[PDB]
Subunit: 288 residues, 6 copies
């Protein structure tokens, strides 16, 4: 039992979405058949629906997706059960590991992932919107990874990081940030998955002021809000002081955490050779 | 007799509006046949009309809906009578429960709803634009809920909250806020319903300064304006000092309030499998 | 002899303009046959012409209506005579009743209207852009009301208020405000009607500074400029100190005013049931 | 011999431009046959050409009119001679009568016009962008008046005022103002006409600071720049201290000026009754 | 031997570009056959190519011209030789005569032009973006003049001024200014011409601060950068202190300069009479 | 063995991309057959794919390229080996030579290139976004040069400079800068090439503050980050103090560096003569 990296699976899915008319849909996919989940997300004014491993199709409704459905949700029939989450008494929902100038956001994610993997849980980690990682970390990349994990036999998913999503919703210039964090927790509950998100507002002017106000938001919207107060590396080993919030505890708690340093094109080429290249027409490409 | 939650009914209606050409209309609906009401709202420059349980259709007039009709209204023939509102001497119109840093906006809404339900009134509550709630809380979601309650046997409707509507009209950067609050009260009178709205400008920079100026606006535009001055939780029990305005009293009144803590996908999947996906054409999707 | 309320007549006209292609025009109307007046207004870059009770049609000229015609005017053939205005020696033109923090804008309008009605004049009052009033108060709603009164046997028209028109032209962030106030006075003279407009820049940051600069503008552009300096309610009775300007008096005059408190869907449903719904095509809906 | 008012002639020409496809052109006009002049102006990215009394046609070039031709010019073949300007030794070119808080811009224009009319010159005056005047005063209205006077037997033209043109080019928030003032002087020379323009930046925040910088600009770009320093009315009579610049005098001169107070729909209706109403198509209406 | 003025030749070329579909091209031109040069410039996202006297055609590539080609260049086959530039040892490249509050930009240009004309060089001068001059001075007007001189027997070209080009690239609110100045020098070298440009940031808020930073930019990008430090007129005669930079001299040098005051529609009418007027279609007119 | 300049090869490729419909693609190219690499980049919402010497084709996906793929990557099958990089123990990846007010960015690039060329490596240098250089330096020009070097027998590529790319992503007004620097390093690793980038934020207001924050970013995202602290020229010879970062060294190191001063249209004309000119249609030209 080891941690599965969804990054390449998300990358190759983005390669397939770039080569076809999404209104017609991308059929004969193999995203996962373990759970019968349907992810519905907003891409600007368009809706992009991920059918449970069958298909991914886009719709352009007469009215904006922002008014109609907001951010995005997950629907499942008949049901979704994560037997191992019950076994290990791990509640479904979203967690936010947030750090400022102290850093150690990625280190702690790797620590908690390997720890969860050791306990017998099926752990998945997606790398995005950070240095040395190929995924740009867009809202589409988060929902693609979320769906890929949801429909598959994944119990705990680690999304590192939401840096691009935060910037995309103009978090560096917030209602939109709240709606996103609520939707991500709502999603994790509906899919009955434990999703652990990470964020460092390093693109923001006042990094630490953004950390406290985002942590206060995360505390209300998400199941767990974890703030890295301090972080120090000692060769292989690390140690970090953490502030943790669990809804609905009106009391916050300090939580020390230490351990060892745990470390983590065929589709497009095929298109280029065959002219199958205007599949948008009069509608401008949408972006969330 | 218990409180009915309109949230899922609004959610499934949004699912049907996202899957069809609204110019043609969404027919064979079952919104309600108790009252013969027609809701007419603005979505950008478009008009979205809710026929009384028959149908929901959109029009794209030659001139903007903003100039033509402004926000939105309700028309009814022949008449609308809420016998229980006369019985319990409850005047039709809109109420605004507004709070700042003190909070307790949701708690008081739940308190007043259960209290109204106990008196024998048909109470409906719609959850939106807040943490742990699926509805994003758009203007469309407010008018959808308003119509669903209007055409049904609902005497008192609780809309918690207008946080997204407030942000949508740029209340965080107001004439547009005034027009909305007036239209909502005008609607509640035309439909002969008691609609109780809630707001907390928590996305605003100066929260308490926004509370006083919105409360002053609400006092003129709506039947009742309720400002939560203070709020404290004592285990199960709560207590709050409230400032209340009733038009046209040139005198405001303090009003103490205490009690116990009262607590509150098939359509889209069917579309994804069948290519029925450009139903907008040359006109850009509208948003209010 | 009593005051006629044009509000519902304007509302039902807006209902007819929302349901048809205005390029083709709205025929078989009954706006009024007393005077042969034609109202020509600008809606963005489009021109909306009101024929004298026959018809209302829109044109989309090759060049902007803003360059071509500016705001709006009235043309009449052969002539327009208001016999009662001569009888009571009331000059045709526009008047602006403006107030700040003192208020009493609506009270004085009701006072002057009932007073004019008592003298034997045919008085019409249109309610817009204010609390408890259905009309949103757009530029289209002002010109609709102006034309409806113009073609009918109306001698004095009271437009309360221009709050939305002021905001529409960005008066809260002015050349556009000047052009509007001049056009409204020019209109009232061309139609040979006494139109009394009201304004309170309550949406403006510095309300009283806006009052003095708008009153100075009104003094030059309009026949009468009335500034409510003070206002106090004494049960039924009211009293207000007023500053009045008449062009071209280089001297202003104080004017005390006291008295008693005087108080003031079938078309759309028919459309919804019959698919007659894209009547704009490639041209975006215009807004002034 | 009296002063001719071009205002109504400009108004009725705007009525004809609003009712036809300008790409096809407005033929069988009678603007004037005295001189063989062609006015070429910019309306956004479009070019609107006035043939010498024959015709007015619009072109939509592949590239913007702003890059291609800038503001506007006049071309004439074979030649244009104003015999009376030689007789009375009046140089062709543009003059700018500018005033601030002192006012008396209109009074002096009326004084100089009647004075020029007395000397035997053919004087024309166009009223625009000011109170009690129907013309909105757009760039199109200036060039329409300029052409109508140019092709006719007019020696001196008074354009009161350029207030709207100044606001249109964003003079109240300048290169665009310079280009306009240079083009207007260049035009008057090419047409061999004496055009006297007037301006009061009363819509500007700091009125007097705008007066000095616009007067400094006018001094370089135009033949004569006249700044009204002071102005006072004494019943019928007036007196004003004036600063005058003539290029290329490196010395300015004071110039006292006193005297008496000198004072100054069928086409559209025909269209409304006959559906001749989309004549723009895919190109958005242009505005300068 | 005298100085040739390209202004009218540029003006009549702009008249031909405004009357045809540039995608088809403007054929049978007589721009010059002395040198086989092709000017390629950017007009927004479009590319406007000037073939060497044959033709001027525009292309609308799938991707923006800004990404593809940046500003503009010149290509020549087989070769371009200016025998007189070798004779008089004048290096090919661009020169920038820049002045602030001191002025004398035009005077020095006229002085250096007549001086170059006296030495036996073929001198051309184009007048633009300044008072008493018909050309508006756009980027298109600069490249039109550059090409007309390039293909003709011109050794030294004087472009007075780049005031409009500077404003066009938002120099008054810079990377875009740098790219333009580099492209103009690159052009002059490729065409083997001596082009002398002039600029006065008189539309800028802080004129002299803009002079020093533009002179520092010009020093790196162009062959010669000439800053007019002081300037004084003494009747006919003038004198000016100048700072001069030649790349790559670390050291700047002062350079005194004195002397005498040297002083400097058929196509469109033909179109108006013949309907040949939509030649753009769905693509919006481009502007640089 | 000498340094190859890719500038003209990039220039002639841009000439071919400007003359055809990129949706159809540009076939029969000879970019390089040494390595089987495919470059995939984003141009606004469009994707521009460079097949390994065969072809360059553009796609316009239903959803934005920014959400789908972010910046750009390289895919290669079966494999890419740079035997000389192993021989000389030079790791594949991106390097950033950054300087502020000290300069000497170009001098050091020329020094390191000639040094690498002496060691036996195949060195390529592309000149862009700087004075005396024809390439404007856009994102397209960087990826064009990157691909041309990648598919060819190039071991070390010097891109001088990223000044335009930095401005293009709004670095002078950052998440977008981070994503670009990460993608460029990711690219260099995937292609197994040593790419050395250069930057001087000379268009930025505070040049040196931008240098420290970009160097801190480069330190995390790229293999090597080189900051020029000081630089002085002594005739032929130069000397510079440098701060160098190698990931993942938590210690920075000073590094002195001295040496001698080392110094560095047919396709378009063919198009102009033959009308092959609307190849975009309804989709607006994209720009990154």
């Amino acid at each position: 039992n080891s941690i599965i990296d969804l990054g390449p699976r998300v990358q190759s899915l983005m390669e397939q979405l770039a080569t076809t008319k999404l209104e017609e849909g991308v059929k004969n996919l193999d995203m996962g058949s373990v759970y019968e989940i349907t992810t519905v997300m907003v891409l600007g004014n368009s809706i992009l629906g991920f059918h449970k491993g069958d298909l991914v199709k886009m719709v352009r409704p007469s009215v904006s997706a922002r008014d109609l459905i907001g951010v995005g949700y997950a629907t499942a029939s008949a049901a979704v059960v994560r037997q191992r989450l019950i076994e290990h008494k791990i509640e479904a929902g979203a967690e936010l590991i947030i750090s400022g100038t102290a850093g150690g956001k990625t280190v702690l994610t790797n620590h908690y992932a390997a720890q969860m993997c050791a306990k017998g849980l099926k752990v998945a980690v997606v790398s995005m919107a950070e240095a040395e990682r190929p995924l740009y970390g867009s809202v589409l990349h988060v929902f693609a990874a979320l769906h890929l994990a949801a429909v598959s036999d994944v119990d705990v998913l680690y999304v590192d990081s939401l840096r691009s999503v935060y910037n995309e919703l103009g978090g560096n210039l917030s209602r939109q940030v709240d709606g996103m964090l609520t939707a991500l927790d709502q999603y994790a509950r509906a899919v009955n998955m434990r999703v652990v998100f990470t964020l460092n507002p390093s693109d923001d002017e006042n990094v630490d002021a953004a950390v406290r106000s985002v942590f206060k938001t995360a505390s209300a919207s998400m199941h767990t809000a974890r703030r890295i107060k301090s972080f120090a590396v000692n060769g292989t080993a690390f140690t970090a002081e953490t502030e943790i919030h669990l809804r609905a505890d009106r009391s916050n708690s300090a939580n020390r955490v230490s351990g060892d340093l745990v470390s983590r094109g065929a589709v497009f080429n095929q298109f280029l050779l065959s002219g199958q290249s205007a599949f948008l027409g009069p509608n401008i490409p949408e972006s969330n």
